[PDB]
Nucleic acid binder design. Structure first.
Ligand code: ATP
Ligand code: MG
Length: 120
DNA sequence: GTGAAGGTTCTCTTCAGTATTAATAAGGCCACTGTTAAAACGTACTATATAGACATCTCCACAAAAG
């Protein structure tokens, strides 16, 4: 039935290349190039997440033989009230590493070496 | 020829074991939530306690007619 496929499409999300998104992507390129920390702020449902998420898809990881993958940009969304250990786990899991045991210091230290290992 | 070394037997072990009255426990790190006083602290719907710009009435003093 034709109707089912259109409803199945219309319930799903899509990405539209708005100039608001292009503005962030060119700007994030400047901050990434300058290796500069910054923030993105705006009202709810203005599209910040979709623009940032689209930017991560624009710079998917790269690989070399017998080397870990290199991951130019990491995008994470913490859970609410994210403590340090769970932020390290978020970063670690995005880089596909695992850390089953350790102090918070051990989670931090493993995060530092996997971040610089993948060269984010 | 008193002393030293050496010989000899002593049984049966189907008997003894198995139950309570029991003490608060005897675990320690890490992290991570989620209560639990209880302390610190913004600001509301009120109950009064005045302080003083005004309006009012009253008492006393002056021009027109008649004998
Ligand atoms: N670039 C876009 N293309 C298509 N749809 C978009 C885009 N940006 C936003 N939307 C629509 O608006 C919704 C809200 O956008 P988004 O998730 O980016 O919100 P947000 O700005 O990160 O908000 P919040 O701060 O509330 O989390 C999306 O889920 C999507 O439905
Ligand atoms: Mg968002």
């Amino acid at each position: 039935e034709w109707l089912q496929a259109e409803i199945a499409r219309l319930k799903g999300k899509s990405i539209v290349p708005l100039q608001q998104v292009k503005t962030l992507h060119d700007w994030l390129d400047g901050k990434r190039k300058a290796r500069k920390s910054c923030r993105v702020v705006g009202e709810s449902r203005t599209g910040k997440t979709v623009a940032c998420d689209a930017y991560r898809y624009r710079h998917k990881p790269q690989q070399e033989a017998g080397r870990p993958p290199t991951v130019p940009v990491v995008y994470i969304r913490p859970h609410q009230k994210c403590g340090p250990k769970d932020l390290f786990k978020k970063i670690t899991e995005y880089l596909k590493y695992r850390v089953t045991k350790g102090t918070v210091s051990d989670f931090r230290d493993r995060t530092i070496e996997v971040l610089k290992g993948c060269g984010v």
